[PDB]
UniProtKB/Swiss-Prot annotation, chain A:
It comes from Homo sapiens (Human). PROSITE patterns: UBC_1, UBC_2. Belongs to the ubiquitin-conjugating enzyme family. The keyword ATP-binding applies. One of its GO terms (biological process) is protein autoubiquitination. Interacts with SCF (SKP1-CUL1-F-box protein) E3 ubiquitin ligase complex. Interacts with CNOT4 (via RING domain). Interacts with E3 ubiquitin-protein ligases CBLC, PJA1 and PJA2. Interacts with PDZRN3. Interacts with PPP1R11. Interacts with E3 ubiquitin-protein ligase PHF7; the interaction inhibits cleavage of PHF7 and promotes association of the complex with the nucleosome core particle. Gene3D superfamilies: Ubiquitin Conjugating Enzyme. This is Ubiquitin-conjugating enzyme E2 D2. Pathway: Protein modification; protein ubiquitination. Keywords: ATP-binding, Nucleotide-binding, Transferase, Ubl conjugation pathway. The active site is at 84 (glycyl thioester intermediate). GO terms for molecular function: ATP binding; ubiquitin conjugating enzyme activity; ubiquitin protein ligase activity; ubiquitin-protein transferase activity. PANTHER family: UBIQUITIN-CONJUGATING ENZYME E2.
Curated annotation (Swiss-Prot), chain B:
Residues 1-22 are annotated as: Linker. This is E3 ubiquitin-protein ligase CBL. A zinc finger (RING-type) spans 23-62. Forms homodimers; IFT20 promotes the formation of stable homodimers. Associates with NCK via its SH3 domain. The phosphorylated C-terminus interacts with CD2AP via its second SH3 domain. Binds to UBE2L3. Interacts with adapters SLA, SLA2 and with the phosphorylated C-terminus of SH2B2. Interacts with EGFR, SYK and ZAP70 via the highly conserved Cbl-N region. Also interacts with SORBS1 and INPPL1/SHIP2. Interacts with phosphorylated LAT2. Interacts with CBLB. Interacts with ALK, AXL, BLK, FGR and FGFR2. It is found in: Cytoplasm; Cell membrane; Cell projection, Cilium; Golgi apparatus. It is linked to Noonan syndrome-like disorder with or without juvenile myelomonocytic leukemia: A syndrome characterized by a phenotype reminiscent of Noonan syndrome. Clinical features are highly variable, including facial dysmorphism, short neck, developmental delay, hyperextensible joints and thorax abnormalities with widely spaced nipples. The facial features consist of triangular face with hypertelorism, large low-set ears, ptosis, and flat nasal bridge. Some patients manifest cardiac defects. Some have an increased risk for certain malignancies, particularly juvenile myelomonocytic leukemia. Phosphorylated on tyrosine residues by ALK, EGFR, SYK, FYN and ZAP70. Phosphorylated on tyrosine residues in response to FLT1 and KIT signaling. Phosphorylated on tyrosine residues by INSR and FGR. Phosphorylated on several tyrosine residues by constitutively activated FGFR3. Phosphorylated on tyrosine residues by activated CSF1R, PDGFRA and PDGFRB. Phosphorylated on tyrosine residues by HCK. Ubiquitinated, leading to its degradation via the proteasome. Ubiquitination is negatively regulated by IFT20. The modification Phosphotyrosine is found at residue 13. It comes from the Eukaryota. Changing residue 13 to F: Strongly reduces tyrosine phosphorylation by INSR. The chain holds residues 359 to 435 of 906 of the full protein. This protein has one functional calcium-binding site. It comes from Homo sapiens (Human).
Amino acid sequence: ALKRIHKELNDLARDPPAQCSAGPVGDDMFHWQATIMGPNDSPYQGGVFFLTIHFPTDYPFKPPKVAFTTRIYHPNINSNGSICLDILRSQWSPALTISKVLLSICSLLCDPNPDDPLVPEIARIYKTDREKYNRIAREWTQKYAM
Amino acid sequence: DHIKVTQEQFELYCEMGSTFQLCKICAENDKDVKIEPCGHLMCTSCLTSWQESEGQGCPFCRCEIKGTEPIVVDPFD
Ligand SMILES: [K+]
Ligand SMILES: [Zn+2]
Ligand SMILES: [Zn+2]
């Protein structure tokens, strides 16, 4: 796993993602931190969201574990920061870069998948009153992400 | 079957801080195998580790593997 994690860190230095960064916490190459700027096209706009990334010993044949640190209001992300995203479980492929994972998480912030929710009550609001969902998401961004 | 890195491939990978011939799954071994029909290149132990991990299809696109062709990539230099 080390050689692949090492190339990921180089790849982020060579080609920094837009509005995303990640890198190891201290001396442990298997525990990283990430930051995501709330996409401008979403209710998270203006927010700065922190994440943890844990690489398992069998990475990249198993996905890294990625979770929000920053509290966020979203149908696919629960209060523990767990993220329901297909490429992090059943749709994982070893060739996905950390950069593509982060960009997929940003797309998920722009466009939730409410029919495969982690938080049903939020998904319900997203499917029914979108203006309300947006309102609440902004207030949470403003409260915890700024 | 031998594949020779072109100059433009060499320039591309330099700009990305790597080489064409390096397997991008492990970032350790060079690519020894071509998967069909998709054409994705990787090393054999990565293909093997993928299947050993319960992974499905091609390690890149997860498409059915209809064939595996041994290959050798000759670096540009
Ligand atoms: K390194
Ligand atoms: Zn490999
Ligand atoms: Zn493929």
